[PDB]
């Protein structure tokens, strides 16, 4: 139940609410839960996963950033 927004320089991809995110941060893969502590990371070429009521959507991400309020 966290307002996740996959925003790309071309267009906004998602703006829904999500249970958990399997973020592939540069230092290492990190999971995010609705009350995650403030964070700001760097992504690397990999696969980013979203858990939506047990449904996993593997958006492949070749790079980017992440702000986790």
């Amino acid at each position: 139940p966290i307002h996740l927004e996959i925003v790309t320089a071309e267009r906004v991809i998602l703006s829904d609410d999500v249970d958990m995110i399997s973020a592939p941060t540069k230092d290492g893969r990190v999971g995010i839960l609705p009350r995650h502590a403030p964070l700001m990371t760097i992504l690397e070429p990999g696969e980013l996963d979203i858990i939506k009521n047990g449904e996993r959507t593997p958006f492949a991400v070749s790079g980017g950033f992440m702000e986790v309020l």
Binding site: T25, K26, P38, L39, T41, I42, F65, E67
Partner: protein, 145 residues
């Protein structure tokens, strides 16, 4: 814009700073070739809806010059879209800036995972590309108007 860019060089050369130009679009590319300021890097044949990957061919070169010390400062000249009837040329500063005014600057302490310097050294190249991309898209809208 060519009058704005043409006159902008005058002050820079008056104060003693050598000037280099990067052109987007064939109109700007051809004008500077005839005048004599051969552009270091140009990007033409941009569609009505270009992607940010298209401008990397120039934005990367401009930033790499700044890191190497070749360019001490960077500017962009774009057609601001004030209204559907008026499109004044606009000049913007590209050099990374301190907190733009104030935006959640308070009550913030992000635990930068790869490192505070690592994030900053990787987000500035993307931020300036976004500014160039935003100027290009705004100029395209102003061109059709």
């Amino acid at each position: 814009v060519l009058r704005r860019a043409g006159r902008f060089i005058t002050e820079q050369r008056a104060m003693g700073r050598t000037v280099d130009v990067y052109t987007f679009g064939r109109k700007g590319r051809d004008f500077f070739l005839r005048t004599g300021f051969a552009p270091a890097g140009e990007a033409t044949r941009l569609g009505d809806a270009p992607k940010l990957e298209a401008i990397l061919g120039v934005a990367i070169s401009a930033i790499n010059g700044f890191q190497s010390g070749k360019y001490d400062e960077l500017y962009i000249i774009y057609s601001e879209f004030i209204n559907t009837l008026v499109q004044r040329p606009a000049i913007k500063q590209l050099l990374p800036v301190e907190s733009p005014d104030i935006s959640t600057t308070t009550n913030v302490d992000y635990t930068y995972e790869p490192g505070e310097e690592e994030v900053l050294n990787s987000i500035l190249p993307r931020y300036v590309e976004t500014q160039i991309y935003q100027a290009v898209l705004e100029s395209i809208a102003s061109e059709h108007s």
